[PDB]
């Protein structure tokens, strides 16, 4: 029975006994490979985070390294370039920025969590349930409204004159220019992808214009649906939240889950050498890091406490189920999930801006 | 003011401005934080000039990362230091010497345009990078007059069987091949594509710097007759390299002392914000003839490109210059 | 390459003050945890207490309340241990241990403190 | 306070047998035990972490915990002590002393 190390950044120690008991049900699981649990919390600094990857991670052999937040939102940033350097897989938890789906900055991320622009998925199948046909499309003009934009119209063409695209700087508050060009444009159906400080300053601006009222229909993500945006969002408001994005209980004992199944994938192949003892002294990349890589993207586990477990060619997970939240008389009501492939109706009244109802019919 | 400059033992290379020279060949991601982090504290430096012995692309990943950290400008000068990867982070101060994608792909095109090799095939990994490098030579070749017969994109993955490699290799049908991926990958495409007899004479494998890489480290799985466009130009020395990049930094040092009035002390220590950097007057500097300036993404806008070519004795020939006014000039 | 390195052995008669060095290599000094343990010449393993390296936080024992004291030099990399007021039950030898993740084991210990208490 | 009491204090194993200590503890103190050998004249070496060289096993996890080793060597000669890292403050267990047979 050879050991078989796997690294872990979490939050508490609480969640860290998590984490090995995780690992420890997992060798229940059946034998022959035994796995241990290798584990450190966040560091002040990331000069310090990223030398506690060297010292306390890497010095252990581990095959691939969780990462979560630290309490109290780009900072796997850190634990992705120095494992990176080694080709070693990082397995995000919680963090859902854009910006570790660029291959050419974190080639060896994976993501228990999709990205906020996968939210576009759920977008793309309301436009069939309703058979819209003429969206409006507002995004910020930063590394995550591009990508909510890309995604969307990429399922669109694959069956860009179905959606209009206006973008705005972030940061900025005098959006009345940028919301007179989209009533100009026949605009029903609107699709705001902004951060919480950003679609605040669009609400508020939509109550100047009268586009908060019976003519239009606001489709949004989680962000846009989170704090100062949610007090100053249009009643009738339909934003979605990601069911268990937030637990990183979950996401430990699902991301070791699979994990542990990859491991004994790889295992049953030829040539396979241990991840690199240590930083200091070695300069060359694991040998095994690639295909191991390889081995977890094309990692099925469909039995996962957050459902069915598989990523896309980015890292990014896939069949993840959200939550229609609909805004009515200042509560978000949930109308509905976001099944994983199709949307399942809830029988509750949907609240459309303005006072009139309907629901998720057909 | 004070800045330190790191080599490594290649090129044979043994030692206002405050010049701190070291030489070390650890460039591992806890040496490369140690030895930037040693020399801030103990030493007020304001700059970095690095360059290393290594292919490894990581480690211009931890200098950008340091430099972030740490507010130190660090030049990548050789080595992966210099290699052109990942978009330098706006709030680092990280440059590298060396090409985009793009403008390695405006060589590659010119070097085919002027030999009428008009009929070529593209051959690509998932290894990132690679839809950049697509998507500029079938946007230019489209709309643009420099290709005019390109079969269809061929995909790899060399992490895959060699029978996934080789059945996905035989579909090539041109002279011409236009190979791109990483210098690990390269070693296991060409020793593979050797077997189908797709590496001789009657072949011509162009290949951009990321497969050449280094022109020290040569790998005998390369063909003899391997065509690359490559910016360690052995003819543009080491010694050279350190004087361009104090160059710049005294540059942006003297241009920074009126804008401000100051020079920004090092940091305290790595271990437990400026409101004026040497970011700005450091993209827009000229030294002796050619202006060394970078872009928003960290790479150079006039770099020193140049064609390379595996002579049959394991050794790269320079046959082509493209540095002088923007036009290849072959040999 | 880690290491950690202790003073000599010290003879002090009652009511005296002893401090003694704790010298570390090899890691990043303020990630990790300073702990002190005492061993009487027969008896076992007793645990002083601990202190936080980032944060200077010390945290002492009920029975090591009182006199003993933790203190801690992170530019030369060394964490000292204060006694004051000597009995004849201070004869021991004290042990510094590295505190994996600040509050974790004990992952690499001293050579050891031979400490005597006698007039 | 916590109170770690480990027995046997003193066993006697052959070269190549299987050696099983146990250490109890008074409360619950969930995986946070570590175990330590004490050689003839060096310091404490942490042996295993978390209650998990490849001959020492770790197995038990509140308040009853073991230490195995499957092929003694006649360098495992002193002593054993498990640590409680979960409560403050931190306590050691009396220690048992590894004789060998010969």
């Known amino acids: 029975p050879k050991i078989v190390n796997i690294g872990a950044v979490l939050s508490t120690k609480k969640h860290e006994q998590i984490f090995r008991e995780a690992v420890n049900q997992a060798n229940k699981r059946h034998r022959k490979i035994q796995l241990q649990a290798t584990s450190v919390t966040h560091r002040p600094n990331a000069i310090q985070m990223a030398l506690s990857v060297c010292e306390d991670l890497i010095s252990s052999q581990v095959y691939a390294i969780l990462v979560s937040h630290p309490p109290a939102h780009l900072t796997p940033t850190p634990i992705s370039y120095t494992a990176g350097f080694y080709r070693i897989p990082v397995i995000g938890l919680t963090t859902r920025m854009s910006i570790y789906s660029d291959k050419s900055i974190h080639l060896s991320f994976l993501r228990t969590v999709p990205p906020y622009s996968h939210q576009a998925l759920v977008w793309f199948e309301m436009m069939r349930l309703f058979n819209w046909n003429h969206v409006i499309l507002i995004v910020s003009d930063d590394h995550e409204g591009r990508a909510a934009q890309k995604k969307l119209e990429t399922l669109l063409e694959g069956k860009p004159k179905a959606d209009k695209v206006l973008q705005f700087e972030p940061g900025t508050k005098n959006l009345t220019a940028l919301l007179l060009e989209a009533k100009e444009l026949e605009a029903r159906v609107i699709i705001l992808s902004a951060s919480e400080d950003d679609a605040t300053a669009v609400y508020k601006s939509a109550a100047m214009l009268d586009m908060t009222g019976a003519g239009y229909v606001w489709l949004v993500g989680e962000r846009e649906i989170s704090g100062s945006a949610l007090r100053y969002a249009p009643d009738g408001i339909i934003g979605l939240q990601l069911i268990n994005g937030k637990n990183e209980s979950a996401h430990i004992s699902d991301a070791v889950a699979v994990v542990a199944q990859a491991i004994h994938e790889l295992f049953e192949m030829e040539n396979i050498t241990d991840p690199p003892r240590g930083c200091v002294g070695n300069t060359n990349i694991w040998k095994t890091g690639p295909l191991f890589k390889r081995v977890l993207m094309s990692s099925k586990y469909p039995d996962g406490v957050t459902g069915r477990i598989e990523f896309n060619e980015d890292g990014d997970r896939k069949f993840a189920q959200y939550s229609i939240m609909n805004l009515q008389n200042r509560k978000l009501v949930q109308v509905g999930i976001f099944n994983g492939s199709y949307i399942i109706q809830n029988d509750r009244k949907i609240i459309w801006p303005g006072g009139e109802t309907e629901g998720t019919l057909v | 003011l004070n800045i330190a400059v790191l080599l490594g033992h290649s090129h044979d290379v043994t030692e206002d401005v405050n010049v701190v020279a070291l030489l070390m060949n650890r460039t591992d991601p806890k040496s490369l934080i140690t030895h930037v982090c040693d020399l801030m504290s103990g030493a007020r430096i304001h700059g970095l000039v690095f360059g290393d012995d290594t292919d490894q692309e990581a480690v211009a990943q931890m200098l950008d990362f340091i430099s972030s950290q740490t507010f130190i400008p660090i030049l990548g000068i050789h080595g992966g230091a210099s290699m052109i990867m990942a978009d330098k982070d706006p709030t680092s101060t990280f440059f590298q010497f060396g090409a985009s994608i793009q403008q390695q792909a405006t060589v590659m095109l010119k070097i085919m345009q002027d030999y009428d090799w008009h009929v070529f095939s593209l051959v690509t990994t998932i290894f990132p990078g690679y839809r950049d490098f697509i998507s500029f030579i079938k946007t230019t070749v489209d709309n643009s007059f420099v290709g005019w017969d390109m079969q269809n994109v061929i995909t790899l993955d060399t992490s895959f069987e060699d029978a996934k490699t080789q059945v996905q290799l035989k579909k090539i049908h041109s002279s011409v091949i236009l190979l791109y991926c990483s210098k690990d990958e390269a070693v296991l495409i060409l020793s593979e594509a050797r077997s189908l007899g797709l590496t001789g004479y009657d072949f011509f494998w162009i290949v951009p710097s990321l497969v050449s890489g280094n022109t020290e480290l040569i790998p005998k799985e390369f063909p003899s007759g391997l065509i690359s466009v490559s910016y360690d130009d052995w003819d543009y020395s080491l010694e050279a390299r350190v004087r361009d990049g104090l160059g710049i930094l005294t540059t942006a040092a003297s241009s920074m002392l009126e804008k401000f009035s100051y020079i920004p002390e090092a940091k305290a220590s790595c271990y437990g914000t400026p409101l004026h950097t040497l970011h700005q007057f450091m993209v827009n500097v000229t030294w002796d003839g050619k202006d060394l300036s970078f872009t928003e993404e960290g790479y150079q806008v006039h770099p020193r490109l140049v064609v390379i070519v595996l002579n049959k004795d394991r050794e790269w020939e320079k046959v082509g210059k493209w540095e002088n006014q923007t036009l290849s000039l072959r040999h | 390459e880690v290491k950690l390195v202790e003073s000599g052995p010290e003879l002090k008669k009652p009511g005296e003050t002893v401090k003694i060095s704790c010298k570390a290599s090899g890691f990043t000094f303020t990630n990790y945890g300073m702990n002190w343990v005492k061993q009487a010449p027969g008896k076992g393993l007793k645990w002083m207490g601990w202190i936080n390296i980032y944060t200077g936080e010390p945290t002492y024992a009920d029975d090591f309340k009182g006199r003993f004291a933790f203190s801690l030099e992170t530019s030369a990399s060394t964490a000292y241990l204060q006694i004051n007021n000597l009995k004849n039950e201070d004869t021991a030898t004290y042990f510094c241990?590295?505190?994996?993740?600040?509050?974790?084991?004990?992952?690499?210990w001293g050579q050891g403190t031979t400490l005597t208490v006698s007039s | 306070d916590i109170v770690m009491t480990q027995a046997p204090a003193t066993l006697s194993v052959t070269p190549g047998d299987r050696v099983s200590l146990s250490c109890r503890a008074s409360?619950?103190?969930?995986?946070?035990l570590y175990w330590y050998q004490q050689k003839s004249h060096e310091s404490p070496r942490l042996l295993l972490k978390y209650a998990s060289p490849s001959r020492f096993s770790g197995s038990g996890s509140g308040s009853d915990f073991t230490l195995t080793i499957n092929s003694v060597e006649p360098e495992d000669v002193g002593m054993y002590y498990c640590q409680n890292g979960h409560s403050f403050p931190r306590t050691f267990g009396g220690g048992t002393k590894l004789e060998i047979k010969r």
């Open positions: 241990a590295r505190g994996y993740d600040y509050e974790g084991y004990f992952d690499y």
């Open positions: 409360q619950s103190i969930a995986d946070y």
